[PDB]
Amino acid sequence: SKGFVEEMRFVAMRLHTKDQAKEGEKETKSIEERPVAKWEPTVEGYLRFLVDSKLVYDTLELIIQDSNFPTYAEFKNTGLERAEKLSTDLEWFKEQGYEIPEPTAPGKTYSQYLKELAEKDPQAFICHFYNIYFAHSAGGRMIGRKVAERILDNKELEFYKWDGELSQLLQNVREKLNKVAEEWTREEKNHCLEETEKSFKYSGEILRLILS
Ligand code: HEM
């Protein structure tokens, strides 16, 4: 009742583990659901995660920049875009001497699924849009810090930097999400919310690469 973004957040928080957040109701079943403080990332797995994340963000950001669909065009130039930052960070790993892997199935499958939804199901597409970006600025930063401390000697990658002030950029996007949702039917809103589990499933398989 605080606007549709609060409904999306309520549904998403319920899908965390208690090992992740106060409101979480999921059991800790997989290795990527362990408390971040207990994670043991490797640079090799982290690179696979960054490459597979880059494909997903490339897909999201290209869909939005090239679209004339007013729902999608509302989210051009949010300040949250990550594709170029990830390119810079993949460049930094190359100069440190690491070889950059090719995108694997978790990134390819998610990127492919997002294109299909962008063409056919805007309500579902928006749900993934919200969960991918707003996860990254929430638990994603906790993961990035833990990875930086343990294996990167506190390098702060561009992936975890924003050109404006993060909290205002997020609230601007929240307002735009509420704006597009007010032109949806209640069922369409409901379809968006029911999509959240799929977003955790696809994102969860990418996060797992950090630990593989
Ligand atoms: C290791 C994995 C994860 C951890 C440790 C984590 C942790 C957190 C934490 C601590 C918060 C903030 C809770 C609060 O301040 O009340 C949060 C918010 C959130 N998380 Fe996660 N999370 C993880 C994975 C995910 C995934 C896979 C998704 C979705 C694909 C997701 C979606 C969200 C969303 C949408 C929010 C709301 C952020 C906002 O309101 O701006 N999280 N998460």
Residue numbers in the entry: 71 to 282
Give the text the authors published on this PDB structure.
Arabidopsis thaliana heme oxygenase‐1 (AtHO‐1), a metabolic enzyme in the heme degradation pathway, serves as a prototype for study of the bilin‐related functions in plants. Past biological analyses revealed that AtHO‐1 requires ferredoxin‐NADP+ reductase (FNR) and ferredoxin for its enzymatic activity.
Furthermore, we reported the crystal structure of heme‐bound AtHO‐1, which demonstrates both conserved and previously undescribed features of plant heme oxygenases. Here, we characterized the binding and degradation of heme by AtHO‐1, and found that ferredoxin is a dispensable component of the reducing system that provides electrons for heme oxidation. Finally, the electron transfer pathway from FNR to AtHO‐1 is suggested based on the known structural information.
